[PDB]
């Protein structure tokens, strides 16, 4: 359908046209940069050179939105889905039952995320002279998503911006021109995220949590405001001491009950992703233990062995940030926990009160559990940092 | 090891144990062949698991079994082991010739043809190449130009629908000019004793295939390149009832190649499967 | 329930089995209090993208955004959107040259009329001229006779203009229609020619991004067997028009196809009003 | 249409190519007040949008009274005749030939770009021959309110029937005897087809492939046509309309004495 | 079984010592398969398609290339080659009783095919002869072309009257003319014969799964290749002929790797 | 050495300036225990992609991975792959009708021949008919008289069949070749006609490397000026055959051209053998 | 050592002070490189293609642009521009026995090209004048086109009969007619003069795979901008004519930074 291909490629302004042209020359760097963008300071975002091109490509994609769920097909490295080994090299023919069992087991119930640019085909993968990895994927796309086809030299491969979270459902073992392949059938689970747009963040926060302040008693409001202003510094520390078992006290206990009541009354109304900048204390580390360094490969691989997948447990409350931008106060910590939150979890918005208590922060109940998905590394200046995509399990 | 779904050695979207032991389509997904599923009125299909379209026709096992190719294709094609094949013929009537007043190009001819179709599927064009024999001689072959092509012909019907005058075939060129000329010996030959016969040789056509955006499209698909492979991996069956005919194909196994892992049927079952 | 869609047409199964209504381009569960308000109550199939064969989908129809020429009667997803065009002729004339062959030329004055709902966009009606048993000729109209954007309920040259002239048996306009000699001695005494249509073609519009409609490539030639095979026809006369519609029907033979069933007493009402 | 709903339903105006609410201190300034339909893109039918027609960034050859998103752009061309000339020769079939002198004329708002009028030639109430317009006789770029052979040139000549120039217009025998003594030939148009121009974001129109022929049904099925005479030049426009039988289409309502100024001005 | 240098989805050692397809995957060759009845194949390991036909080695071994092609063409050596010919009968002429162009001709031809593959749109170019003196060369127009001509089948099926050929122009007009001396000739002493010159067609190729396209492919550029590196073999049964082309190795160069064959084996491999 | 390649035929500099053979599709330096195994030793230019001029690169032409009908003599990178085709005539038969204008019609029996290495795939010559220092007509063969796959050393009607007739001058084969009366009055005495050929055009088949070699769109008609503006010709006769070759050569004037020179005694042996 | 403004991958200092290609890249211009046998070039540093011809400065400087273009088109200040014309001979006329359309004409033409580049198609429009009255204009049909028409040579290579031009219609038919008074006027004393007016033919260039496409390009739209800002220089040594089109600076404007020449220097820069 080169007809629509060319017919869509004149509704653009000069900047968009030249940028889509240049995309055929600097694909991989554009993609990899668009992956890890919002995790900087506010400084370099509005300052970097390849900002005009990201901006114009985003405003090119967002224009054309389809009107019915549509299927796509693309080959995917098996590494992104927590599989750091081999299923078969590029010179074998078939895959063994043992490796298939391992794969089928290790992705039982997870939810993975994707937030980069992407090229995509639409027909079935026949003699396209390109099929690198042994894991085809057969995905579905929901209503009103971006899509923009460039009319390349001979092929017409459309271009999308995957900004959502998928989950694998069904895997089978097919054959193509002699060789073997795995096929997976995945969908898209809806999520609401503000990567950088913090004005809309505040708008949503207020509009959703303002009318909540009147579901409490004035002593509870006063007490929770006490606990939200300064008390945390000491209060939650009591929780670390395993108070209610080892050393009891009813004062801080009633304070705990105040907070827990105040949080339970109103949940979050929709799937929401939050970003909490953690550090070494929470993960069996310090600023001294050799493991805390993440320039060398052996440390990263030992960490991806130990924690990746295993469950995490928290005794105290969780005060999370919404804006995924690196602020000033965390210029020393090197871990950005990235949690997902379902419609039905406790909490509220501390930046819903007029008065300094927190810049776009949300509460999560104490003594909770986290199931971790996938660990990645991103570079900044001289040092790398570990992004840890982990799911909140109810 | 190798649970039911974990093996599917082609892209038919039907697992192997099913496609080998007996299955049924339900809610757009395949399921084991139970026996209590007989009362509701489903049908038990078996097929081949090494091939993508086990009959030859241009639809796969899944599309034919589920019922998602068209809606005018008779319900004798849903079975995977029965090809979806049309058979179109031409019948002549009311020959009329006219002189002009020479010894070459001395009379012009005009015949009245009416098409008809038997079989399962429809055709979306018809351009039958017909030749006019005259007592051991082909007076002329001719292929239907633009005026005589019919479109959307159905199964069990006629092109000029039942109750309308036939079609007139008289012009020989591509752009319709140059009325069919005749000799002078043949003028005297067919005026006195004999008469002309017409017979078809081949028919082109098309078949509507669903696009990637719903709207079916049928320009670029031909029936002339699947006939060479249906006539050679099947067996033909022709029923008659002295009011209309019937034509069907049924796929038979090649008992020589051990790689040909096609299911096999006996006559006492193929006759029942291709009709009911 | 409200969370799955096995057909991919933007209407969940529960609505497609209990009735719904469009309110600001979104499906809404059918309530009893909209009837007075002026709304409607559609039901349709939940296993197909379009449950009437016609080239518009369930949602695209029900929402009422396919086009702004199709009658309102063609929105309830159980009623096909199908045009029916015919050709009525008159004023047939002859012309002699004064040769036992090609002794006279013919000419006919035709006019196309249309009944139904949707409009055709480039019509070329194949018609044959017949005389007392012997098919005199067949002809498919060339570029001089294609009539673009014919509407529902009207005729090609609008009421107030002259009929159309058909005289030419060639893909390019030349080589006027010939005739025998005896056939000239057969229409001077008592008889006269007849003209009957056999088939008609012609595209059909379809919307796009900003409207931006296109009518090149789409064709009514392949949604006709599919509709004539499953639907059921209904006609009505008024002494002034000829109303004509199609209505789909549930095939009870197979225990798999799932689609609602109607009553003739309700089919007539739902078809005309 | 990238204009919000409050503006589109209560009142708005384009300024610096961006929308703005409507105060009441601009009539002395020279603006207007627009209204539209807040569910669809093009609420009038014509192939431009609400924002395009509102701005004025669609073309420069369209009348200033076609911006109001309820008055469509709709070119309406007709054919006028003069100086029939027949020619004898020396049979009963093809006994003379015909030649007409046609001249087009456009009333409406938008232009047309490749006009190919289909005309039929009637005599004594008997259709003689219908005829398209071949390569020679298809003028282009017909502006609003002008003719193809502009004022001051000799009219155009139509004298050939085939799709290539051949087989000059024949005529029977009896018809010659008729039109020589008493009567005369009279032609009339039946339809016209031609393209329209679309801009882009960098000032370059492209009108090879569009068609005014597949929008006319919908512009003429949802509108009221209003005409006017002046003994100088006729005028004709369309104005949209609502049907109070449907609670779906939220198009505003007009009157007669308001439409007459919203359309002609 | 380590590496693959030719990109045909078969490893070298198998492609060189003997392999067999099984469940659409290659497997080494044992000595306990000839009882059940699998075949045994060998090929060349620096080329994708070892014969010259448009298919590859694996596509020909698995049997996933077509269905009406004879089994004897499954092997990677025995190429696929449709040999089509034209026969003529019942030449009738017709005079108009000019000095030139004093009569027209009309022939009744019939096509036939021997060999393996099918041709999908035949268009044989035929030229007339008369006592060693040609008269007219003509390439069949849109009437006389035939399609889906299966192997082993005369074009009009057995039982229908032949194909009448009498026109010359690209669009049928200006029938075949003949001079006067040639007219006066062909009633007294001699008669006309016909012998083809060339045949141009197409061949069906698969796609992703199921659907095939025969519009764009052509046997007109696979004939020089196929015919320059092989050896023909013919066999007459006096009821139906047979013809095949077997591949053989140019021993001059030492780089070209192709298994040789003793004729006593090339025969028992080509036919059966 | 082995560092880089300034061109992109992926054979490095030293290998391309001192000698190289191809083993298992990989280049290799040239020993002297190789000339006993049955190999050869080439040398080419390390600035151009394709060094002789013909439409195949250095590597393809070197490793014999380009076709299978092209002679073994063209594998060397310095000998251009190039067909040279001609037309022979016989048996001109004329037919007189019964006018001082267009008093007869001619018909010739021609046959094609090809010398050189490569094959052509649609031969369409352009022949004119000269008679007694005067030209009658120039015609370019049409659909009937085009050939297919002239292999080097053969004829279009293969040896055994009758020659191919040539009679009609139009693009669609009608309007038989005329002849003026004076030319006939001159010819009947005992004069004769000479048929000369001026040019030929026809595609060349190139592998698409994704299978399914393509030969539609390509043409020799634009590689002839190039191949024949830089090279030098060689002929050979045998009173039973003929042979033609084109070999590149150096521009002794220019220091930008780096393509090794040869000697007649070596070029003859490299070309023919 | 600076940035390329015009973006032809040759920096400004070089493009302004003389430079030279060597091993596929530019180098500064020493004062003894003329001993090797090199050359010195200058070029505008604002426009990509300084001459107006369809090639760029790097191409014309490195020689990678073609292999059949005369050497003197390398100096970037020398446009590449072929001038092709038509010559006539052997005018014959043929009677037929009407007071109109009473005879037919037939001429024997022969093309020829001078200048630098070749043309890969030729379709010369010629009009036959008769005593100051144009008789019939004609554009070369499919039978009278040529291709690969080298610089200097003719269309029918020397030693062949000339080309025959007789037919008027697009498809070959409708031979050129002539009146009866013009006939009686020319056979008595006069003759027919001929003069071409224009020729249009494509030009070859590289592609994105390694081929050289010669279709979809046209010299017909690079003749306006080359023959607008450039001066012609013609020589003729009676063995062959010579035609060249050099550029120059428009001194009036202040923006045009294109070097200026002296006629004695431009002559040697063109012909060498
Ligand atoms: Ca399967
Ligand atoms: Ca299957
Ligand atoms: Ca649904
Ligand atoms: Ca539905
Ligand atoms: Ca809107
Ligand atoms: Ca709007
Ligand atoms: Ca291999
Ligand atoms: Ca191989
Ligand atoms: Ca190199
Ligand atoms: Ca090289
Ligand atoms: Ca520069
Ligand atoms: Ca420059």
Residues A182 and A210 in one domain: no
Nearest to A124 among E2, E58, E208 (CB): E208
- Say how many Å lie between the CA of residue C43 and the centre of ligand 3: 11
Q: Which residues of A113-130 are buried (b: 16+ CB within 10 A; e: fewer)?
A: bbbebeebbbeeeeeeee
Q: In a mutagenesis test of the B interface, which of A3, A72, A172 is the best target, namely the one with the most B β-carbons within 10 Å?
A: A172
**Cβ–Cβ < 8 Å for A88, A95:** yes
Where would I find the beta strands (DSSP E) of G101-192? 103-115, 125-129, 134-139, 163-165, 177-178
A3 at interface of F, judged by CB pairs closer than 8 A? no
Residue in chain E nearest B144 by alpha carbon? E143
**What is the SS3 assignment for chain E?**
CCCCCCCCCCCHHHHHHCEEEECCEEEECCCCCCCCCCCCECCCCCCCCCCCCCCCHHHHHHCCCCCCCCHHHCCCCCCCCEEEEEEEEEEEEEECCCCCCCEEEEEEEEEEEEECCCEEEECCEEEEECCCCCCCEEECCCCCCEEEECCCCCCCCCCCCCEEECCCCCCCCCCCEECHHHHHHHHHCCCCEEEEEECCCCCCECCCCCCCECCCCCCCCCHHHHHHCEEEEEEECCCCEEEEEEECCCCCCCCCCCCCCCHHHHHHHHCC
Q: Is the domain of A157 the same as that of A207?
A: no
Resolution in A: 3.8
For an interface test with E, which of B7, B104, B173, B225 has the most E Cβ atoms less than 10 Å from its Cβ?
B225
Distance from CA of B93 to the nearest CA of C (A): 10
Residue numbers in A near B9 (CB within 8 A): 173-175
Are the C-beta atoms of residues G108 and F114 closer than 8 Å to each other? no
CA torsion angle for A216, A219, A221, A224 (degrees, to 10)?
-120
Whether chain B lies against chain G with 3 or more Cβ pairs closer than 8 A is no
Q: Under an 8 A CB cutoff, do B212 and A174 touch?
A: no
Residue in F closest to E138 by C-alpha:
F144
DSSP C74: G
Instruction: Identify which of B131, B228, B229 has the shortest CB distance to residue E164.
Output: B131
Contact between chains at E164 and B138 (C-beta distance less than 8 A): yes
Shared domain check, A207 and A165: no
- Using a CB-CB distance cutoff of 8 angstroms, which residues of chain D are in contact with residue C143? 132, 163
How many helices (H) and strands (E) chain D has is answered by 5, 12
Task: For strands A335-341 and A383-392, give the pairing.
Answer: parallel
CA–centroid distance, G43 to ligand 11, in Å, is 8
The answer to whether F235 touches F244, Cβ cutoff 8 Å, is yes
Q: Which residues of D touch C121 (CB under 8 A)?
A: 213-214
Rg (CA), chain E: 24
Beta bridge partners of C8: none
Tokens describing residue A285: 């580390």
B28 CA: distance to closest CA in chain A (Å)? 16
Q: Which residues of B touch E120 (CB under 8 A)?
A: 224-225, 228
- Given a contact cutoff of 8 angstroms between Cβ atoms, the answer to whether D233 and D145 are in contact is yes
With tokens 């040529």, the residue in question is G146
- Contact call for residues G74 and G20 (beta carbons, < 8 A): no
- Estimate the share of chain A in helix, then strand, then coil, as percent rounded to the nearest 5: 30, 25, 40
Spatial distance between the Cα atoms of B251 and B85, rounded to a whole number of angstroms: 12
Beta pairing partners, E41: E19
Chain C residue closest in CA terms to D246? C38
D47: left (phi over 0), alpha (psi -120 to 50) or beta: alpha
Number of CB pairs, chain A paired with chain D, less than 8 A apart: 9
Q: What is the CATH number of the domain that holds A205?
A: 3.90.176.10
CA end-to-end span of chain G: 31
Nearest residue to A162 via CA among A185, A196, A139? A139
The greatest distance separating any two alpha carbons of chain B, rounded to the nearest whole angstrom, comes to: 88
Residues of D in contact with C95 (CB under 8 A): 92-93, 172-173
- How far is it, in rounded angstroms, from Cα F227 to Cα F55? 10
Residues A235 and A156 in one domain: no
Looking at the structure, tell me whether residues A200 and A343 fall in a common domain.
yes
Would you say F9 is a known binding-site residue?
Answer: yes
| Residue A180 touches chain E, beta carbons under 8 Å | yes
Q: Which residues contact C205 (CB under 8 A, 6 or more apart)?
A: C67, C69, C119, C121, C213, C214, C215, C218, D214
In this structure, are A146 and A186 located in the same domain? yes
Taking the C-alpha atoms of residue G144 and residue G155, their distance in angstroms, rounded to an integer, is 10
Phi, psi dihedral angles at B272 (to 5 degrees): -75, -35
Beta carbons of F95 and E198 less than 8 Å apart: no
A355 and A214 in one domain?
yes
**What chain B residue is nearest to E213 in terms of C-alpha separation?**
B225
What is the CB-side half-sphere exposure of residue A260 using CA atoms within 13 A? 11
Question: Taking the mean position of all CA atoms in its chain, how far away is CA G9?
Answer: 28
Q: Dump the DSSP string for A124-150.
A: --SS-S---SSEEEEEEE-SS-B-EE-
Distance F190 CA to ligand 11 centre (A): 70
- Yes or no, beta carbons of A68 and C209 under 8 Å apart: no
**Distance from E73 to chain A by nearest Cα, in Å?**
19
- Report the distance separating Cα A242 and Cα A248, nearest Å: 9
Is A236 assigned a ligand-binding role in the annotation? yes
CA separation for the pair E152, E119 (Å, rounded) = 11
The CA distance from D99 to D187, in Å, is 12
Asked whether residue A236 falls in the same domain as residue A254, the answer is: yes
C-alpha distance from residue A328 to each of A40, A42, A43, A230, A274 (Å): 11, 10, 11, 20, 18
Binding-site residue numbers of E for Ca(2+) are 4, 6, 8, 10, 12, 15, 44, 47, 57
Pairing type for strands C194-199 and C126-131 reads antiparallel
- Closest-approach residue (CA) in chain D for C156: D190
Angle at the Cα of E146 (from E144 to E148), degrees rounded to 5?
A: 175
Sign of CA dihedral E182, E184, E190, E192: positive
CA of D264 to the centre of ligand 12 (A): 57
- φ/ψ of A369, rounded to 5, equals -130, 145
Q: How are beta strands F104-116 and D18-21 bridged, if at all?
A: unpaired
Instruction: For residue F22, report the distance from its CA to the centre of ligand 9, in Å.
Output: 14
Question: Is there a contact between E58 and E10 (Cβ–Cβ < 8 Å)?
Answer: yes
- Confirm if G78 and G206 have CB atoms less than 8 A apart: no
C vs D, Cβ pairs < 8 A, gives 108
What's the gap in Å between the CA of F55 and the closest CA on chain A?
A: 21
How deeply is F5 buried, as exposed, middle or buried, from its count of CB atoms within 10 A (0-12, 13-18, 19+)?
Answer: middle
Nearest CA in chain A to C5: A69
Which residues from chain B sit within 8 angstroms of residue E68, using beta carbons? 228-229, 231-233
Residue in chain C lying closest to B96 (CA): C134
Gap from CA of D70 to ligand 5 centroid (Å): 15
Contact assignment for F211 to A127 by CB distance below 8 Å:
yes
User: Are A280 and A182 part of one and the same domain?
Assistant: no
Residue A322: give the domain boundaries. Answer: 193-394
Rg (C-alpha) for chain C, rounded Å, is 24
> Final residue of a domain: which of A192, A211, A239?
A192
Residue G9: nearest ligand to its CA? Answer: 11
Structure tokens at B173: 């060129």
- CB atoms inside a 10 Å sphere around CB G102: 18
CA–CA separation, A113 vs A373, rounded Å?
Answer: 9
Distance between CA atoms of G166 and G88, rounded to whole angstroms? 12
Longest dimension (CA), chain G: 81
Say if the Cβ atoms of B7 and A173 lie within 8 Å: yes
Unique residue bearing structure tokens 């509709």 = C227
Q: Is F45 annotated as a binding residue?
A: yes
Q: Do F211 and A129 touch (CB under 8 A)?
A: no
Which residue among A169, A192, A215 closes a domain? A192
- Distance (Å, whole) CA B169 – CA C88: 24
Which DSSP state fits G25?
S
E178 CB-near residues (< 8 Å, 6+ apart): E93, E101, E102, E103, E104, E105, E135
Alpha carbon of D41 to ligand 5 centroid (Å): 6
Query: Chains with 3 or more CB pairs closer than 8 angstroms to B?
Result: A, C, E
CA distance F183 to F193: 10
Same domain, A211 and A176: no
Q: Give yes or no: residues A301 and A176 share one domain.
A: no
Taking alpha carbons only, the member of A278, A271, A371, A279 closest to residue A320 is A278
Cβ count within 10 A of residue E207: 12
Domain tally, chain A: 2
Q: In angstroms, rounded to a whole number, what is the distance separating the alpha carbons of residues A174 and A184?
A: 10
How far apart, in Å, do the first and last CA atoms of chain E sit? 31
Name the packing angle between helices A232-240 and A250-264 (round to 10°): 100
Chain B interface, best mutation among E39, E65, E210, by max B CB count within 10 A: E210
CA of A362, closest CA in chain E: separation in Å? 51
Residue spans of alpha helices (H) in G88-189? 181-186
Partner residue opposite B8 with nearest CB, options A100, A124, A174: A174
In the three-class reduction of DSSP (H, G, I as helix; E, B as strand; rest coil), residue B221 is classed as: coil
Residue with the two structure tokens 């209003």: D226
Task: Give the domain-ending residue among A162, A192, A222.
Answer: A192
* Residue A22 DSSP label: H
Alpha carbon A124 to its chain's center: 29
The CA distance from E20 to B71, in Å, is 43
User: Residue G206 forms beta bridges with which residues?
Assistant: G212
User: Which residues of B are annotated binding-site positions?
Assistant: 8, 10, 12, 14, 16, 19, 48, 51, 61
Q: Are residues A185 and A205 in the same domain?
A: no
Strands of B12-137 (E only): list them.
23-26, 29-32, 86-99, 107-119, 129-133
* Cβ-Cβ contacts under 8 Å for B98 (sequence gap 6 or more): B107, B108, B110, C100, C101, C180, C181
Cα distances from G219 to residues D66, G61, G204, G270, in angstroms, run 45, 21, 10, 21
What is the torsion angle, in degrees rounded to the nearest 10, for the CA atoms of residue G157, residue G161, residue G166 and residue G168? -10
């Amino acid at each position: 359908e080169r007809k629509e291909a060319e017919r869509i490629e004149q509704k653009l302004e000069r900047s968009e046209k030249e940028a889509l042209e240049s995309y055929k020359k600097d694909s991989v760097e554009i993609s990899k940069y668009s992956q890890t963008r919002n995790y900087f300071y506010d400084y370099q975002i509005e300052a970097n050179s390849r900002e005009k091109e990201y901006k114009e490509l985003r405003n090119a994609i967002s224009k054309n939105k389809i009107d019915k769920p549509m299927y796509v097909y693309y080959f995917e490295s098996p590494e992104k889905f927590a599989f750091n080994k081999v299923i078969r090299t590029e010179n074998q023919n078939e895959i063994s039952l043992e490796k298939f069992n391992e794969f089928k087991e290790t992705i039982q119930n997870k939810l993975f995320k994707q937030d980069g640019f992407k090229d995509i085909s639409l027909y079935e993968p026949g003699k396209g002279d390109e099929k690198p990895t042994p894991l085809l994927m057969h995905l579905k796309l929901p209503r009103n998503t971006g899509m923009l086809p460039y009319t390349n030299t001979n092929n017409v491969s459309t271009l999308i911006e995957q900004g959502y979270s998928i989950k694998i459902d069904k895997i089978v073992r097919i054959v193509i021109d002699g060789k073997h392949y795995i096929k997976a059938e995945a969908s898209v689970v809806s999520s609401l995220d503000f990567k950088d747009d913090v004005s809309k963040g505040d708008s949503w926060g207020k509009a959703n949590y303002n009318d909540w302040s009147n579901k409490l008693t004035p002593n509870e409001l006063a007490d929770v405001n006490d606990y939200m202003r300064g008390g945390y510094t000491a209060i939650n520390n009591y929780l670390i001491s395993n108070g209610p078992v080892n050393n009891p006290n009813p004062e801080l206990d009633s304070k705990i009950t105040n907070i827990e009541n105040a949080l339970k009354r109103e949940p979050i109304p929709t799937n929401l992703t939050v970003y909490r900048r953690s550090g070494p204390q929470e993960f069996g580390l310090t600023l001294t233990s050799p493991e805390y360094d993440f320039n060398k490969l052996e440390n990263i691989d030992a960490f991806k062995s130990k924690w990746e997948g295993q469950a995490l447990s928290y005794p105290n409350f969780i005060s999370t940030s919404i804006g995924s931008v690196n602020m000033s106060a965390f210029a020393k910590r090197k871990i950005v926990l990235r949690i997902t939150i379902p419609k039905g979890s406790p909490g509220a918005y501390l930046s819903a009160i007029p008065g300094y208590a927190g810049e776009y922060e949300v509460l999560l109940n104490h003594g909770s559990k986290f199931k971790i998905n996938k660990i990645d590394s991103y570079k900044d200046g001289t040092i790398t940092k570990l992004i840890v995509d982990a799911t909140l399990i109810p | 090891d190798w649970e039911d779904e974990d093996l599917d050695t082609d892209n038919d979207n039907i697992p192997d144990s099913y496609e080998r032991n007996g299955y049924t389509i339900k809610d757009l997904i395949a399921v084991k062949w139970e026996d209590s599923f007989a009362e509701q009125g489903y049908k038990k299909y078996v097929s081949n698991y090494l091939e993508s379209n086990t009959a030859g026709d241009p639809y796969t096992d899944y599309e034919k079994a589920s019922g998602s190719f068209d809606k005018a294709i008779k319900t004798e094609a849903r079975d995977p082991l029965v090809a979806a094949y049309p058979i179109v013929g031409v019948g002549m009537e009311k020959l009329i010739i006219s002189t002009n007043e020479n010894k070459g190009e001395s009379a012009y001819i005009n015949a009245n043809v009416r098409y008809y179709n038997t079989g399962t599927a429809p055709m979306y064009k018809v351009t039958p190449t017909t030749n006019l024999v005259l007592d051991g001689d082909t007076l002329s072959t001719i292929k239907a130009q633009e005026n005589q092509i019919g479109n959307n012909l159905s199964p069990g019907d006629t092109y000029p629908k039942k109750g309308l005058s036939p079609l007139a075939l008289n012009t020989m060129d591509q752009f319709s000019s140059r009325l069919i000329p005749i000799n002078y010996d043949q003028l005297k030959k067919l005026d006195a004793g004999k008469q002309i016969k017409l017979e078809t040789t081949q028919v082109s056509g098309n078949f509507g295939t669903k696009n990637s955006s719903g709207q079916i499209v049928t320009e670029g698909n031909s029936w002339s390149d699947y006939i060479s492979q249906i006539d050679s991996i099947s067996a033909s069956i022709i029923l008659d009832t002295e009011n209309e005919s019937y034509e069907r194909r049924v796929t038979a196994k090649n008992l020589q190649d051990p790689e040909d892992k096609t299911p096999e049927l006996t006559i006492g079952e193929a006759i029942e499967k291709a009709f009911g």
